[PDB]
């Protein structure tokens, strides 16, 4: 997250931190995710496509810090890793960038709700907030271009949803952005998601209810003028989500 605020997991209790265990036993941070039901985390296919081996991955819930333990945190393996079969990647754009992770503890248990672990509601069919709506993003991703390490403390920021019309303008993303994607950015280009925030939540208050409107997918640079964050439009993928869970 470029700009924004350091946060804590109780302010973002659906947030999932996903790591990969490497040959050699070192663990690196991969991407964010969102808990949509006790057994299911939702994220982005591009986070896993080059290493589709589910035993590699560690999922944490209730975690506020990248490399330190948080009181009440819970650790999970991936019982099932479901990548979207029509996923593809262009020079900038990623398509069908959505993934599901069925999680279980070593005891075989799914998430147990607490002050620091809760589910986030899915949107209803083809129902998104209006352009100009303020929404939040959360992640452990880069804070600055020059970062070579991710931040230790979880971060959040607030960005505004941008119309498909505006996002398709030639100095924006032209026809590379589609109606299955949502753009969001800071009017002053000061705050944005960035590398490492992919797969994490874009949360909007929709009918008074915290809703998972988007999943961090792509963008040219980070907080770059005329280059919004692009998010998987969760409301389009409900049939896919329903049929796979």
């Amino acid at each position: 997250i470029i700009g924004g605020e350091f946060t804590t997991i109780e302010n973002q209790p659906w947030f999932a931190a996903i790591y990969r265990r490497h040959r050699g036993g070192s663990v690196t941070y991969v991407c964010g995710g969102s808990l949509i039901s006790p057994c299911w985390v939702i994220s982005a296919t591009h986070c896993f496509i080059d290493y589709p081996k589910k035993e590699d991955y560690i999922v944490y819930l209730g975690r506020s810090r990248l490399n330190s333990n948080t009181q009440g945190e819970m650790k999970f393996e991936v019982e099932n890793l479901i990548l979207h079969k029509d996923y593809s990647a262009d020079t900038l754009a990623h398509h069908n960038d959505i993934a599901l992770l069925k999680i279980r503890s070593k005891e075989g248990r799914c998430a147990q709700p607490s002050r620091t672990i809760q589910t986030i509601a899915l949107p209803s069919m083809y129902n998104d907030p209006q352009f100009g709506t303020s929404c939040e993003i959360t992640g452990f991703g880069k804070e600055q271009s020059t970062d070579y390490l991710y931040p230790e403390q979880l971060k959040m920021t607030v960005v505004k949803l941008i119309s498909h019309r505006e996002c398709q303008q030639p100095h924006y993303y032209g026809s590379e952005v589609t109606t299955k994607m949502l753009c969001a950015a800071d009017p002053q280009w000061k705050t944005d998601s960035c590398q490492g925030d992919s797969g994490g939540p874009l949360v909007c208050s929709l009918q008074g209810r915290m809703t998972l409107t988007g999943i961090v997918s792509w963008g040219r640079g980070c907080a770059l003028k005329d280059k919004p964050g692009v998010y998987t439009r969760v409301s389009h993928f409900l049939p896919w989500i329903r049929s796979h869970t």
């Binding site: 991969v30 591009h46 991703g141 792509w218 040219r220 640079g221």
Partner: peptide
């Protein structure tokens, strides 16, 4: 080739 930033986490090409 593969771009940097969001989209290219956990990739050989990154």
């Amino acid at each position: 080739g593969x771009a940097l930033g969001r989209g290219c986490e956990n990739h050989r090409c990154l």
